[PDB]
Design a binder for this molecule. Structure first.
Ligand SMILES: [Mg+2]
Ligand SMILES: [Mg+2]
Ligand SMILES: [Mg+2]
Length: 118
RNA sequence: CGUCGUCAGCUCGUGCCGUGAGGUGUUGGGUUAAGUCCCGCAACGAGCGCAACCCCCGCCGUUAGUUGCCAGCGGUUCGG
């Protein structure tokens, strides 16, 4: 019910542009495309999802980062529905390490939403 | 105080990179008088600069008329 759908379009990408440390999961090469194996894919999906199901109800927050044209609005839609923050548009330089500084930009957003209804 | 020159610049906080000096921000294309602004961006902002806030000169209005003008019967030293 997982790989029945994951075998839809959700596997098989970039030809001859490959980071070869990813070759654990890389299955074959047909029409140039490095097709990715689905078995280790789904077990690695469980390895992620066990951690997500732990640290998602432990008060832990997920930060959904996606910048390409392909993954913009389907990150923006599915990111706001668990309270989890996202970056739909260009994710800036140091939102995380410089978080205490970009908190000032969030507060300027709040003190500008004060100036909207003003 | 003159000067580079009213020239568009010089920086900082924090983050990143770099052993380090130091970058980055401030590069790039566009744009203006301008580091002016926006689009991308390891940058996000901020400070002094620029601009604007000041004043004159421009037009119009309100108030005010011992300057000002004939519109007015009309004096008339016959002259604002
Ligand atoms: Mg500096
Ligand atoms: Mg270091
Ligand atoms: Mg400036």
């Amino acid at each position: 019910v997982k790989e029945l759908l994951e075998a839809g379009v959700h596997f098989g990408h970039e030809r001859k542009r490959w980071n070869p440390k990813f070759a654990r999961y890389i299955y074959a090469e047909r029409n140039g495309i490095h097709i990715i194996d689905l078995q280790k894919t789904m077990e690695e999906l469980e390895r992620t999802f066990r951690f997500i199901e732990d640290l998602a109800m432990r008060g832990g927050t997920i930060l959904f980062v996606g910048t390409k044209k392909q993954a913009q609005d389907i990150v923006r839609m599915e990111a706001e529905r668990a309270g989890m923050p996202y970056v739909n548009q260009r994710w800036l330089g140091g939102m995380l390490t410089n978080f205490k500084t970009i908190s000032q930009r969030v507060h300027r957003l709040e003190e500008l939403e004060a100036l909207f209804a003003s």
